[PDB]
Amino acid sequence: AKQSMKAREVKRVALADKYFAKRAELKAIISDVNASDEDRWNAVLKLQTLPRDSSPSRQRNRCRQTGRPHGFLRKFGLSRIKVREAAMRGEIPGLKKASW
Amino acid sequence: MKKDIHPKYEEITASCSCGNVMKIRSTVGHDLNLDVCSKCHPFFTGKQRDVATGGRVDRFNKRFNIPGSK
């Protein structure tokens, strides 16, 4: 509901995509078994501290536009209640129900 | 040696071994004192740089991995 939880969340998502995309084999180099006495060291954790403040692991793919805690749906940009409000009003393409 | 309530010559002096193996042993020794210790700690992260025994495939100096292979 608060603007501070929306403000944290919005900045994390544009910089998670900026910073981690170009640091996706760094993950392999410093954790996964891809190294075997090769690097495994401080010099690449010099770089993984950037995707940290803003990274997928702190971006719960939610509250980047709406002020509803949990039940978010990243595919609409919305949540439980606002998906239902927009269906009621026909503001979504193809929205019907299953009858089979 | 007593005779008025003890048998003469015993047959409870048998074998030159009495070594235990099919039962309990080394609980505080087995000839002379032992007492062991255990040190393990969570994983073998005891150093700033490890080797891997499940993956031994060579390090690429790349920046893309799953998104690198399209």
Number of other CB atoms surrounding residue B37 within 10 Å: 4
Q: Is A97 contained in some domain?
A: no
Partner residues linked to A73 by β-bridges: A78
The sign of the CA dihedral A7, A11, A16, A19 is negative
* A73 DSSP assignment: E
Any idea which residue has 């239902």 for tokens? A84
- Interface size, chain A vs chain B, as Cβ–Cβ contacts under 8 Å: 57
Residue type, B33: N
Angstrom CA distances, A18 to A63, A77, B10, B15, B54, stand at: 19, 20, 91, 81, 32
Q: Is A96 contained in some domain?
A: no
Residue A57: helix, strand or coil by DSSP? Answer: helix
Q: Is A86 contained in some domain?
A: yes
The sign of the CA dihedral A67, A68, A70, A74 is negative
Q: Total structural domains in chain A?
A: 1
Partner residues linked to B29 by β-bridges: B33
Q: Which domain holds residue B33?
A: 1-41
* B33 DSSP assignment: B
Could you tell me if B41 lies within 8 Å of chain A, comparing CB atoms? Answer: no
Q: Is A20 contained in some domain?
A: yes
What is the resolution in angstroms? 14.7
d(CA B21, CA B23): 5
* Helices and strands (H and E) in chain A: how many: 5, 2
Could you tell me if A27 lies within 8 Å of chain B, comparing CB atoms? Answer: yes
| Partner residue facing B57 (CB), from A21, A27, A34 | A34
Q: Is A69 contained in some domain?
A: yes
Hey, of B44, B60, B65, which one would you mutate to test binding to chain A, going by the most A CBs within 10 A of its CB?
B65
B63 to chain A: closest CA residue: A25
d(CA A92, CA A85): 10
Q: Which domain holds residue A18?
A: 1-90
